[PDB]
Design a protein around this ligand. Structure first.
Ligand SMILES: Nc1ncnc2c1ncn2[C@@H]1O[C@H](COP(=O)(O)OP(=O)(O)O)[C@@H](O)[C@H]1O
Ligand SMILES: Nc1ncnc2c1ncn2[C@@H]1O[C@H](COP(=O)(O)OP(=O)(O)O)[C@@H](O)[C@H]1O
Ligand SMILES: Nc1ncnc2c1ncn2[C@@H]1O[C@H](COP(=O)(O)OP(=O)(O)O)[C@@H](O)[C@H]1O
Ligand SMILES: [Mg+2]
Ligand SMILES: [Mg+2]
Lengths: 432, 48, 49, 436, 66, 66
């Protein structure tokens, strides 16, 4: 069937294709070439996995189409889902709700995972009888498939039971430490054959075993989530809406201290992760200035960045800098350069894309498509793969031939041909 | 059983089967979703 | 002190968004935010399975 | 659509079974190569396996890029989500531009859910809660086809009491949710008082128990916005939240991923189907550099839809930049990610065909000499101008007592109204008098 | 016909707004006639596209008899 | 605020349903934008496509600019 995840621009990438020595294979896990860049990415990935050093910045630089985002996706795939990997674009920090520095702080704190581990004693059973005398004192009877006992209730327990409208046949759990009651469901009897059911009622089997049980919950949350939870009374709602605003720095410091306390007590573990900012040249000079000192914290993840700009203008200034990034930030980061692909690498990438899309192409078609990709661009050839597959299927064919590739080359234009055709009719277009 | 009707009882048992199937389907539907965070995680993360 | 403004509209307008239950699906099967503060990890992960 | 719009005559791409473009079919005249390319794109959209593929329609104004996109939408059908947006719609005052773009992206992705709904509907003849607290509620509903006795979950008693349900009221109860709506009193009780402020409703006609199997299409944005804010809630904070002004919010990526997981669960169960759909961005040159940069990442997602762009600009300055010019107003990095469909200008014969099609769509009879004069006007000024002359000329003909457009009517309308070039000539001849 | 657009252009004080007011008067109160200035679409409450969408929808009426 | 497009689409569908079922009649009207030269390129670009809807009214504009 068709799931929500479909064939994208990087669906063929499963990893960085390295061995135990971080030496890149020529074609492994969906990556071709870029040997030096892939080895550097693997070294950075080992640095991420160790987690000892905080606030390390790497910039993946190269010409368009040279595999920078491909390498970032390979790093993300090779890194486990346990370790956070926040991938944002440079434009996403320009928010109408929070400042650029606040957006970058939230992105930084989203890249650090906190795995919690809480062990709690609970009472779990089916309610048999609730008797309350008059509401000062009462008794509650709970049962399992192997047990049954009666409990003496106080004022607050009676109030909590009456507030939740707990009655016979309800399967509930009670926390011993706090006394909070949550209703799991109700038992099914012959008399509960309802014709209409409420939106929250559900029938469950009576629990087995012992009435007293231990509940162990292990979950991974980020620092930003803990910040949002403690920002306001119902701050967990902002984790859905996103209406977080600018969280106070004092709250963040309190949470850092509390998280350190949890880490000392054994109730939490820190998993520093990666923040990938793609197309960083969209960041303004203020954002770069904030990044300069944000990386210097002890709770800063690894910042992987990617730009394809030459010596260009920094946004918000009139200055020219080698990547659009001020030279002060560039001294804080290691640069991984991606080289242009050769004919063999282009053909291998086309083969991987065809295998990913389940398209059969002849060798002459592969040669023609590689020539087109070298002449125009690799992404144009990748798109022509699917275009030619569709055209071949239209004529009831099974393998894409050179005629299909030529047909889709004539139907769909790259940038160069379109620009030439526009220059032919320049006066027709608007605002030249 | 002089007043017994077979068609009425067949209708009634078909109705009972439909009611039980509806109860099952609704019980499965009403507990299918798991919370993103859950009460335990929020309580653990919620400072005084 | 002034009397309020009595704004009169067609009765059909007040039923514009209303959809009969036989014409709409149950949106409670995608209700994730409603489970917060009511449903626990124990119920979803350990008990119900 | 009773009213005639600019593209009311476009019914499809006009292709044949081989994918080749007919000269005049489905309301489209000419643009054969563009129509064949759009047919390939339609085949791409139907084959749901590709995500994030983008297409640009580049050509001079009036060459049919928007018409081609609407023809693609017609070819897909109403079952496939076609989200039309204008490039200038991302400048919201409530959410950031990237949030608008992602919301439209999720709008384009559709989900089809098959479900059987059960509703108990009728006049209430008995409402008796059974005490053990209340174990259950026994209700009696009456319709024209009989009476049914129902056992209700005790949680529905609160809903029944809130809705103020008494005997003689016409209500419906949802079996799956327990929702109760009291839709008035039965008209058999309309004479119980001479003056009550009640809405009296006829007794329902069918059975008390109504079953319907329905197929409803929803988009991922609908599921996203449903989980952005809580609904209901008897707490004081929940009640006060209903009074707060509804504002669009930057929905988190965590929520997006969780909703994606839920959608995948229901797809695996077999009650949901995914329809990737299409997002059409018109006047894409109104996006600034930040929007294009975000589109670079968004198109690379494995969840994104097919995006169709359209641009009429030549070598012009990108909106957010100082002096950077690009071939279509679009950065060279984004142009590398799109397949470009080129639209050409129309010949006089094609213009005459389009004018005749527009006349037929507008219910206007036009003589051959009038049609030729309109075609000459279109060649002299613009195709859009000639099309806009049909209705006023028909009105003059109707006033003069003629059921058809003659050449004199077209001449009179061309005298009454001016095109852009004629008005510009007038303006250049009177620069001093007009405001600067 | 829907979405037909007409521009009244001319020198200052040449009856452009007079022509518009006469058009509004010739139509009855039954037909909506929304008159705004170009400056009014610039708002701190909503976007320009939202303001124009509200201006457009204010000009189409739904007549319901009961 | 900024009314969601989902509400507007649902309303357009329900209004079409009313018109088809005879429950209501549509009365297209006129939007007049005096001094339209105050609009910017974004507003004009929006107007270019907003006029292509079947629910668009007749648009009348006035300007004295050369
Ligand atoms: N070394 C590689 N191996 C496999 N696929 C690659 C490689 N380099 C690039 N690609 C593919 O080519 C396309 C463009 O590469 P990408 O990394 O997105 O460009 P950029 O580096 O400019 O972001 C993507 O579909 C990507 O999957
Ligand atoms: N090939 C065509 N066949 C039929 N009608 C067309 C064609 N091209 C344009 N039109 C009509 O002429 C008008 C201008 O086309 P449009 O698609 O708006 O051009 P643009 O590329 O500027 O969007 C519209 O009313 C459209 O329906
Ligand atoms: N043809 C006309 N008939 C009657 N009054 C007119 C005519 N033309 C202009 N006026 C009046 O002259 C004044 C100038 O307004 P107007 O000419 O409409 O300004 P503009 O055309 O620059 O918007 C107004 O009082 C207007 O009613
Ligand atoms: Mg990239
Ligand atoms: Mg005036």
């Amino acid at each position: 069937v068709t799931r929500i995840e479909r064939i994208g621009a990087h669906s063929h990438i499963r990893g960085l294709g390295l061995d135990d020595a971080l030496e890149p294979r020529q074609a492994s896990q969906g990556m071709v070439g870029q040997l030096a860049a892939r080895r550097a990415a693997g070294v950075v990935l080992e640095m991420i996995r160790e987690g000892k050093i905080a606030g390390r910045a790497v910039l993946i630089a190269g010409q368009p189409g040279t595999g920078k985002t491909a390498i970032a996706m390979g790093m993300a795939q090779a890194l486990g889902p346990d370790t956070p990997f926040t991938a944002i674009a440079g434009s996403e920090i320009f928010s109408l709700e929070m400042s650029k520095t606040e957006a970058l702080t939230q992105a930084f704190r989203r890249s650090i995972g906190v795995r919690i581990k809480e062990e709690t004693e609970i009472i779990e059973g089916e309610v048999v009888e609730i008797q309350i005398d008059r509401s000062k004192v009462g008794k509650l009877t709970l049962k399992t498939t192997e047990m049954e006992t009666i409990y003496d209730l106080g004022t607050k327990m009676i109030e909590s039971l009456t507030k939740d409208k707990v009655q016979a046949g309800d399967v509930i759990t009670i926390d011993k430490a706090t006394g909070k009651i949550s209703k799991l469901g109700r038992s099914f009897t012959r008399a509960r054959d309802y014709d209409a059911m409420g939106s929250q009622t559900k029938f469950v089997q009576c629990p087995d075993g012992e009435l007293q049980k231990r509940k162990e919950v292990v979950h991974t949350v980020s620092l930003h989530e803990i910040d949002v939870i403690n920002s306001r009374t119902q701050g967990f709602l902002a984790l859905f809406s996103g209406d977080t605003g600018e969280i106070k720095s004092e709250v963040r410091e309190q949470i850092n201290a509390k998280v350190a306390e949890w880490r000392e007590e054994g109730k939490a573990e820190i998993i520093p992760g990666v923040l990938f900012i793609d197309e960083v040249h969209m960041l303004d000079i203020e954002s770069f200035s904030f990044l300069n000192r944000a990386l210097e914290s002890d709770m800063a993840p690894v910042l992987i960045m990617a730009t394809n700009r030459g010596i260009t203008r920094i946004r918000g200034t009139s200055y020219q800098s080698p990547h659009g990034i001020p030279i002060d930030l560039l001294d804080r980061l290691l640069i991984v350069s991606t080289t242009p692909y050769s004919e063999k690498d282009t053909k291998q990438i086309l083969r991987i894309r065809c295998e990913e899309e389940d398209v059969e192409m002849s060798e002459d078609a592969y040669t023609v498509l590689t020539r087109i990709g070298l002449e125009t661009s690799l992404r144009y050839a990748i798109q022509l793969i699917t275009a030619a597959s569709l055209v071949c299927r239209k004529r009831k064919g099974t393998e894409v031939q050179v005629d299909d590739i030529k047909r889709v080359y004539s139907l769909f234009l790259d940038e160069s041909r379109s620009t030439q055709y526009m220059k032919e009719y320049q006066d027709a277009f608007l605002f030249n | 059983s002089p007043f017994y009707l077979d068609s009425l009882e067949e209708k009634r048992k078909r109705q009972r089967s439909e009611r039980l199937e509806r109860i099952f389907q609704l019980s499965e539907a009403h507990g299918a979703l798991a919370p993103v965070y859950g009460t335990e995680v929020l309580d653990f993360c919620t400072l005084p | 002190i002034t009397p309020g403004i009595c704004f009169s509209t067609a009765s059909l307008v007040l039923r514009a968004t209303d959809v009969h239950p036989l014409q709409r699906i149950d949106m409670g099967r995608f209700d994730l935010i409603g489970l917060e503060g009511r449903v626990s990890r124990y119920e979803a992960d350990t008990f119900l399975p | 659509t009773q009213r005639i719009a600019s593209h009311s005559h476009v019914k499809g791409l006009g292709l044949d079974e081989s994918g080749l473009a007919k000269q005049a079919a489905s309301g489209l005249v000419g643009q054969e190569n563009a129509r064949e390319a759009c047919g390939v794109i339609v085949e791409l959209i139907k084959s749901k396996k590709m995500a994030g593929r983008a297409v640009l329609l580049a050509g001079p104004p009036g060459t049919g890029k928007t018409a081609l996109a609407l023809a693609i939408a017609q070819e897909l059908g109403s079952k496939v989500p076609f989200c039309p947006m204008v490039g200038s719609e991302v400048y919201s005052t409530e959410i950031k531009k990237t949030e608008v773009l992602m919301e439209n992206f999720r709008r384009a992705i559709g989900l089809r859910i098959k479900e059987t709904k059960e509703v108990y509907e009728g006049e209430v003849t008995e409402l008796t809660p059974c005490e053990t607290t209340i174990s259950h509620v026994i209700i009696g509903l009456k319709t024209a086809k009989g009476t049914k006795q129902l056992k209700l979950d005790p949680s529905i008693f609160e809903s029944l009491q809130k809705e103020r349900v008494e005997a003689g009221d016409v209500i419906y109860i949802e079996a799956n949710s327990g929702a109760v709506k009291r839709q008035g009193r039965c008209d058999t009780y309309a004479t119980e008082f001479d003056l009550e402020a009640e809405e009296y409703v006829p007794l329902p006609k069918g059975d008390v128990h109504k079953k319907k199997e329905i197929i409803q299409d929803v988009t991922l944005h609908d599921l996203d916005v449903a989980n952005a804010r809580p609904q209901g809630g008897q707490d004081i904070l929940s009640m006060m939240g209903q009074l707060m002004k509804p504002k669009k919010t930057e929905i988190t990526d965590k929520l997006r991923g969780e909703i994606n997981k839920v959608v995948n669960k229901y797809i695996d169960q077999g009650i949901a189907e995914l329809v990737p759909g299409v997002l059409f961005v018109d006047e894409v040159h109104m996006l600034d550099i930040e929007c294009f940069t975000y589109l670079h990442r968004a198109l690379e997602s494995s969840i994104a839809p097919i995006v169709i762009f359209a641009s009429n600009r030549g070598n012009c300055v990108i909106r957010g930049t100082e002096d950077i010019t690009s071939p279509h107003g679009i950065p060279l990095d984004l142009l590398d990610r799109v397949m470009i469909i080129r639209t050409m200008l129309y010949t006089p014969q094609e213009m005459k065909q389009i004018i005749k099609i527009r006349a037929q769509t507008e219910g206007i009879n036009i003589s051959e000499e009038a049609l030729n004069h309109l075609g000459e006007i279109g060649t002299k000024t613009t195709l859009r101008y000639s099309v806009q002359l049909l209705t006023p000329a028909n009105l003059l003909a109707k006033i003069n007592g003629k059921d058809s457009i003659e050449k004199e009517h077209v001449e009179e309308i061309s005298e009454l109204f001016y095109d852009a070039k004629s008005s510009a000539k007038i303006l250049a001849d009177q620069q001093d008098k007009y405001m600067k």
